Structure formats: C-alpha cells, structure tokens
Amino acid sequence: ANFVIPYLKPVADFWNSLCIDQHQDSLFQFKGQTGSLGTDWTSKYLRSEQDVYNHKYLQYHKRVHEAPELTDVISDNVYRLTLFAGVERVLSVRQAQAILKTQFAGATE
C-alpha cells in the first residue's frame, strides 16, 4: 500500500478505463438530487444506455462540421498507425521486392 499499490493501482485504473463504460461510471458517481427529478440511479442508467449512440452521433457531428482535430483523426484511424503500422512496411517491401535483394537473404518473392 506504501510501495507497490501506488504503482499497481494506476495500471488497474487504466485497465478499468479501457473496460468500464466511463461516461456511465462518471454519471453514477454523482448520486443525489438538487431539486430536479430524473437524477436518481434508474434515470441515470436509462439515459446512459441511451447516451452511447448519442455520443457516437456527437463525435461524428464534431468530425463533420467543426474544424478537424489531430487526436480525433488519429483515434479514428488508430489501427493503421499503432498496431498494424508494420503492415505498411510489409506492403512497401513487397512493392519494392523485385529489385530489393531480399530474394538473396532468406526470403521469397
């Protein structure tokens, strides 16, 4: 708790953020009412389960109408750039393979 948990807990928090619905969880954090109906757990759950598609629509609306942002585009094309970025190199090598001597070092055409 003094030497390991301060380092292990952030990893678990990141894991939960990737796994748990963040908007719904944040909505559930503020439990109580301040003079309005529909702020209880049931109404918050219902709006949160309707808020997934609304949030998708809002993200698409921001991408289409407002000025584009680099983070939004990158996250929209995250698999081409982060995980399968080496497939681009593979395709480039395949295209250039006809004159690239790779046939003479443990590789086929």
Partner 1 sequence: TFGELQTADDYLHVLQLRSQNKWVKNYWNRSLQETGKTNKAHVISPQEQLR
Ligand X SMILES: CCCCCCCCCCCCCCCCCC(=O)OC[C@H](COP(=O)([O-])OCC(O)COP(=O)([O-])OC[C@@H](COC(=O)CCCCCCCCCCCCCCCCC)OC(=O)CCCCCCCCCCCCCCCCC)OC(=O)CCCCCCCCCCCCCCCCC
Minimum CB separation of residue 30 from partner 1 in Å reads 16
Contact between 30 and partner 1 (CB under 8 A)? no
Distance of CA 61 to the CA centre of its chain: 18
Contact between 9 and ligand X (CB under 6 A)? yes
Contact between 64 and ligand X (CB under 6 A)? no
Contact 71, 81 (CB under 8 A): no
Contact between 34 and partner 1 (CB under 8 A)? no
What single-letter DSSP state applies at residue 85?
H
Minimum CB separation of residue 13 from ligand X in Å reads 6
Q: What is the largest CA-CA distance in the chain?
A: 77
Contact 48, 23 (CB under 8 A): yes
Tokens of 28: 């559930």
Residues that bind partner 1 (CB under 8 A): 37-38, 40, 42-43, 46-47, 50-51, 54, 57-58
Residues that bind ligand X (CB under 6 A): 1-5, 8-9, 11-13, 15-16
